Amino acid sequence: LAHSKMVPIPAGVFTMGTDDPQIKQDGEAPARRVTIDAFYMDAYEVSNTEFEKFVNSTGYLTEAEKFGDSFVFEGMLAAAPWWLPVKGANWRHPEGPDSTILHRPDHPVLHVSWNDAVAYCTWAGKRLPTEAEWEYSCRGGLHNRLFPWGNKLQPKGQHYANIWQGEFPVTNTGEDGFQGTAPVDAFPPNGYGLYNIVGNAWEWTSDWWTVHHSVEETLNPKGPPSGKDRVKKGGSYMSHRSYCYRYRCAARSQNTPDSSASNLGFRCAADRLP
Amino acid sequence: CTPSR
Ligand SMILES: *[C@@H]1O[C@H](CO)[C@@H](O[C@@H]2O[C@H](CO)[C@@H](O)[C@H](O)[C@H]2NC(C)=O)[C@H](O)[C@H]1NC(C)=O
Ligand SMILES: [Ca+2]
Ligand SMILES: [Ca+2]
Ligand SMILES: [Cl-]
Numbered sequence: 055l056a057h058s059k060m061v062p063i064p065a066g067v068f069t070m071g072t073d074d075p076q077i078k079q080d081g082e083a084p085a086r087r088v089t090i091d092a093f094y095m096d097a098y099e100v101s102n103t104e105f106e107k108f109v110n111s112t113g114y115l116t117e118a119e120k121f122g123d124s125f126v127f128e129g130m131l132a133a134a135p136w137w138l139p140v141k142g143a144n145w146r147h148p149e150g151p152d153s154t155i156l157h158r159p160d161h162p163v164l165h166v167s168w169n170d171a172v173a174y175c176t177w178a179g180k181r182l183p184t185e186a187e188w189e190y191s192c193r194g195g196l197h198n199r200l201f202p203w204g205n206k207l208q209p210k211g212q213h214y215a216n217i218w219q220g221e222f223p224v225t226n227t228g229e230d231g232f233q234g235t236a237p238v239d240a241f242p243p244n245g246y247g248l249y250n251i252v253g254n255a256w257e258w259t260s261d262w263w264t265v266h267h268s269v270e271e272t273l274n275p276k277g278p279p280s281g282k283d284r285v286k287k288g289g290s291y292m293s294h295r296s297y298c299y300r301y302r303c304a305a306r307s308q309n310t311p312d313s314s315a316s317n318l319g320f321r322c323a324a325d326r327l328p
Numbered sequence: 329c330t331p332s333r
Pocket of ligand 2: 216217218219228229230231233234290318
């Protein structure tokens with residue numbers, strides 16, 4: 055296993071956002087041309103095993119451990135009735151105190167805040183990606199497509215990401231092979247070598263959140279200089295067309311940096327190889 | 329999709 059491996063994301067110009075927004079309130083529009091310098095992106099979401107190496111090295115206590123709770127989705131035992139703040143839910147205990155990660159070492163780490171993610175990435179000689187870097191990487195060398203692989207959800211009749219099937223939130227059929235998370239190396243890679251960039255765990259980025267974007271061309275944009283919420287991308291194993299249609303590269307959402315939940319993780323980036 | 333703390 056090489057679950058901390060990085061891939062080179064080539065220099066290029068891409069269209070960020072879309073002029074056909076599907077969730078207009080999230081500022082998916084307008085489409086804008088962004089230039090990104092070559093850099094490196096983690097192939098995989100950070101796994102439990104990789105996060106444990108960080109904790110073993112540093113002794114780091116995550117914010118959820120310090121606060122004493124984190125958000126867990128009801129269907130696997132708030133902003134919605136299906137989100138419960140559970141005492142003792144944290145990265146080692148993803149559904150609460152009597153859950154464990156022993157049987158899912160290769161699944162993405164969860165219940166990690168933006169600060170937790172920045173601590174890990176920096177420990178590793180890396181950083182969080184910007185939203186623009188993230189989206190560029192998600193798109194995997196294709197222009198103006200819904201998903202990393204194209205516009206069809208199940209190309210060639212194959213599942214390409216871990217999201218929800220069935221009637222959310224009552225019934226997840228597990229048609230794609232996973233009710234909760236999947237290993238970080240599950241499903242096909244995109245054109246750049248990235249796994250689970252949409253679906254599985256949501257992913258933190260470095261940017262502060264705004265929904266107000268200029269159409270102006272930009273170079274290595276960092277997002278606005280201030281804010282209250284940081285940007286997350288890509289959707290999760292909970293996402294579905296019917297309620298949280300955010301397993302698209304253009305999609306975007308946000309949380310306060312001290313937030314944590316059972317569907318939110320991250321991957322790192324770096325200017326050069328560490 | 330994820331509630332804030
Ligand atoms: C994190 O550290 C723990 C504690 O050292 C590691 O678990 C131990 O590893 C030793 C050395 O191989 C084993 O002999 C012990 O049986 C383990 N003890 C426990 C408490 O399980 C663990 O492997 C480290 N994790 C990672 C990902 O490196
Ligand atoms: Ca699934
Ligand atoms: Ca993901
Ligand atoms: Cl979701």
